[PDB]
Each structure stands twice: as structure tokens, then as C-alpha cells.
Amino acid sequence: DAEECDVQADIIVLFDDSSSIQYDNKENYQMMKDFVKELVDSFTTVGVNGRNGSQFGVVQFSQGVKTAFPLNKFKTKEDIKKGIQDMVPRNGGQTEIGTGLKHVRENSFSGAEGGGNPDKQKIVILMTDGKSNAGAPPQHEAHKLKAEGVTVIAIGIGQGFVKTELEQIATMKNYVLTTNSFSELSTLLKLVIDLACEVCVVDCAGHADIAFVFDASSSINANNPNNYQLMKNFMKDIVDRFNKTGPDGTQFAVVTFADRATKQFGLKDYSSKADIKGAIDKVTPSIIGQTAIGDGLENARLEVFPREEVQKVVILLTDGQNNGHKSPEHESSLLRKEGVVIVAIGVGTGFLKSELINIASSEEYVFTTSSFDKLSKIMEDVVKLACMSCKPRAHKK
């Protein structure tokens, strides 16, 4: 039940030192410290030599931010653990999550504090018992941080944090871990190491199973008879960006939705790009003007996904709000729990962004455009996500 990660990394822990923690229980800080010590002892290359080594730093945040120690301060696990033990919580009267994230981006990973080595994965583990209520706006700071190639894991403790805020901050919604008490932190260790050791890269030549789940309502071609073809061209252009299709590379499937959902083709129907693109083009729209986003996702879950070890992706496109036959929140949750990464795109003024946000793996994976002609504007960003390939590297000690 104890694991390790052999990945070379610079790891920053963002450690809430708000007064709420001390008020709740005088032993809470010790339990937080112990948890962080256990993290240190989970990374095998911490304390290694020179260029094959991992580093650890800790930054306290509540009212303002204090660096407990930088990445380059200590050189062995023991010394790092002593550093953690010697930390003095400040018991601030505010919780500035965003200011913490900003400090980490601007200082913690800088050359001056020992960061910047390109062979190293950058990881931030945030621990908080509160909601951000002052300082730099957190969603924006989290965006800039992650844009620099930083993985963000968020741990929420007790009843005072808000889960959707942590979900916006973390790399994906399932990089958020929650527990009811500081006493149970240790039950999250394996999960945190598993996420920290998840290596995600952009690789359009990898093995992936990709499902387009798209709107085929009569509404699409209402204000412009080109819309449906523009949407097909967008999907065909995405297919063309993969190096190789079929069982030896990338497999594609299509599900469409209107009042209900229909599997047009599964992952094993076609192996050539020409066949995949021609199959996309043959798909006909419904004469019904409903959009069953929930049914589309259910269909992908039950009829498309059940290749093993391969990255699974759903790219969903809609021009309307859900009809309620199935719950998009529930169906997407089930898909994401199975390892499916979900990208959500709304086109026009008929969709609801809340629903896109509910189904996507992250609000960073949500895209909106005013028209089908402007799908080209989001193409590059969508491809980078469609090509994302995540590999778990943690294993038992």
C-alpha cells in the first residue's frame, strides 16, 4: 500500500498556515507536517547526486506567503524532513490561494531558487482547509502556472474549502483530493503519489482511442446551411493531425446526439484516415431540434470504450443545452473515473457554458466560439489536448 515515484522532479508543497487550522485542533499542523514528510520519502530520486536528483520546497500561505525553504536548500531526505519539522506556521487571518500560486510561479521554480532544469517535471501540491478570500485571483494564477508545464494537485481538508475552486486550480478535476479531517490525511498518500507520478505529454503519434461526440440537431443548420459541414471539416482536420490511425496508432469513433444518441461508428470500424474522414462526412443530421448531451456521453461510455492501456479521449461539440434525458454531470463523472479525458466545445449562443464546464476534465479544456466559421480559431488548442497522452509511473515500494 506504500508506493514510490522514480520520476525526476522539482516538487513544491503549498502549505495553508491559516489560523483556522490551529483553532480546530492543536495537533493538526503536526499531522500536515507528517504527511509532507511521507511525500518526501515517496520520491526515490530526492537526495540523489547531481543531475539525476529531485528537489523539494515548501511555501506557506494564508495572509501573504512565506517560503519555508527553496528547492536548492537541502540535499538529503533527512535534511528536507527536518526543514519541514522546523517550519513555523504563521496562523494568518486570510486565505490567499492565488497569491500562493503566483509566488510559486514567480519565485519557487525560478533559477534563483534551484528550479528551471528542463529534464525535471514540475509539480505543485496544494493543501488547504479554506476558500480563497483575498489576494491574487486564484483561477487566473493557476492558469499561468499550469501554462508553464506545472502539474497541480489540490488537497482539501474539512468543510471550509470549496471543491469547484480546487477543481479549477488543479490540472484536472481528478487531481483534487478531499478528506474530512487532518487525521485522515495519510489515507490520501497513495493517491497523491499516483497523480504526482502521472506523466502527461503531447504526442500525436501515441496510442489513443478518440471519440467525437457531436450535436446532430436540426438547429445546427438553422441560421447557416454551412454549419454542419464546417463542424465535420473541423473533426476531419483533427483526424489528419494524428500520425497513424488504426490498431497500431489512433482509433476514432463517432457518436451523435439530437433527441437521443446514436453510435455512428466504433473504434474498430476503420483503420485509414481516408475511411475515417469519409465516414464522418456521411453522417446525416436529425430533423429534431433537441440536444441530448447526456445521452451522447452515456452512449460513448456503454458502446464505444468498453483497447487497453491506451489514452481515451472524448471531444464533445454542442450548439444547445441538455434535454435532461441523461445527466451530463453524472455520465462525464463515470467516463472520467475510467480514465477518459473530456474536451467540451460550445458553438453559437444556444449552449450553456455551465454544462461544458460540468462535463470537461478541466475548465481549461472548455472552448466556446460564436460561429462554426470560427472553429479554426480553437483548432490548435483542441489538437494539443486530443493528442495528450498520460502514463502512470508510480509503483509499490
Binders of Zn ion in range 188-217 (CB under 5 A): none
**Does 271 show up as a binding residue in the annotation?**
no
CB-nearer residue toward Zn ion: 55 or 251 = 55
**Cβ 135 to Zn ion shortest distance, Å:** 14
99 in contact with Zn ion (CB under 5 A): no
Q: Give the number of residues in contact with Zn ion, rule: CB under 5 A.
A: 6
CB-nearer residue toward Zn ion: 17 or 209 = 17
3-state secondary structure the chain: CCEEECCCEEEEEEEECEHHHHHHCCCHHHHHHHHHHHHHCCECCECCCCCCCEEEEEEEEECEEEEEECCCCCCCHHHHHHHHHCCCCCCECCCCHHHHHHHHHHHHCCHHHCCCCCCCEEEEEEEECCCCCCCCCHHHHHHHHHHCCEEEEEEEECCCCCHHHHHHHCCCHHHEEEECCHHHHHHHHHHHHHHHCEEEEECCCCCEEEEEEEECCCCCCCCCCCHHHHHHHHHHHHHHCCCCECCCCEEEEEEEECCCEEEEECCCCCCCHHHHHHHHHHCCCCCCCCCCHHHHHHHHHHHHCCCCCCEEEEEEEECCCCCCCCCHHHHHHHHHHCCEEEEEEEECCCCCHHHHHHHCCCHHHEEEECCHHHHHHHHHHHHHHHCEEEEECCEEC
Binders of Zn ion in range 101-160 (CB under 5 A): 129-130
**Cβ 204 to Zn ion shortest distance, Å:** 29
CB-nearer residue toward Zn ion: 20 or 245 = 20
**Cβ 21 to Zn ion shortest distance, Å:** 6
**Cβ 5 to Zn ion shortest distance, Å:** 7
**Does 275 show up as a binding residue in the annotation?**
no
CB-nearer residue toward Zn ion: 29 or 351 = 29
**Cβ 113 to Zn ion shortest distance, Å:** 26
CB-nearer residue toward Zn ion: 133 or 272 = 133
Binders of Zn ion in range 15-34 (CB under 5 A): 18, 20
List binding-site positions for Zn(2+).
4, 6, 16, 18, 20, 129, 395
Applying CB under 5 A, the residues found at the interface with Zn ion are 4, 6, 18, 20, 129-130
